[PDB]
């Protein structure tokens with residue numbers, strides 16, 4: 001019940017304003033299971049982005065909703081388990097822009113853990129979904145929780161670059177209007193939108209140049 005049991009302490013402190021809302025989400029999800037409507041990712045993964053330190057975030061990535069196919073979503077936006085192939089479509093697209101931007105080899109697997117360990121917060125606007133039903137928990141109460149997370153990140157003294165992928169960009173930028181923050185957007189990396197501005201957007205090196213402009217250290221994006 002205390003957030004301190006589910007997330008890292010800095011996050012628990014940051015999210016105390018929505019701790020009741022998080023408790024109501026737990027009840028909603030419990031009811032979904034009782035109704036035979038599973039949800040994804042696994043319960044223990046829902047708040048996984050908030051298990052890496054709040055104080056160490058330098059880059060915030062915000063996507064839309066978790067992967068709807070069972071066996072994909074792991075609670076870090078866009079990430080999959082390291083044995084997963086094919087990669088989901090959005091991640092394949094992400095990884096092509098990665099190589100085009102940074103010149104590194106194509107990654108071996110789809111596990112974005114290393115980014116999360118290096119201060120990239122891999123957030124979705126909505127933290128759960130019903131299996132095979134894209135975006136099906138929109139409007140169910142997560143937006144209050146992720147707004148609190150974003151706003152708390154922005155309120156810290158430290159430099160932050162937010163990378164906003166998809167339709168939530170315009171709602172989120174006002175949350176990130178503060179002096180130590182830069183928010184950069186593009187259409188979502190899913191294939192129907194990616195062709196319209198995700199490809200060629202160079203978010204990884206852009207984010208690093210902006211961090212260096214703020215006197216912060218750039219992210220080591222290199223995946224194995």
Ligand SMILES: O=c1[nH]cc(Cl)c(=O)[nH]1
Nearest residue numbers: 063064065066067077078
């Ligand atoms: O974790 C995510 N997976 C898939 C999508 Cl489309 C997204 O926006 N976020």
Ligand SMILES: [Cl-]
Nearest residue numbers: 088089090190
């Ligand atoms: Cl996808």
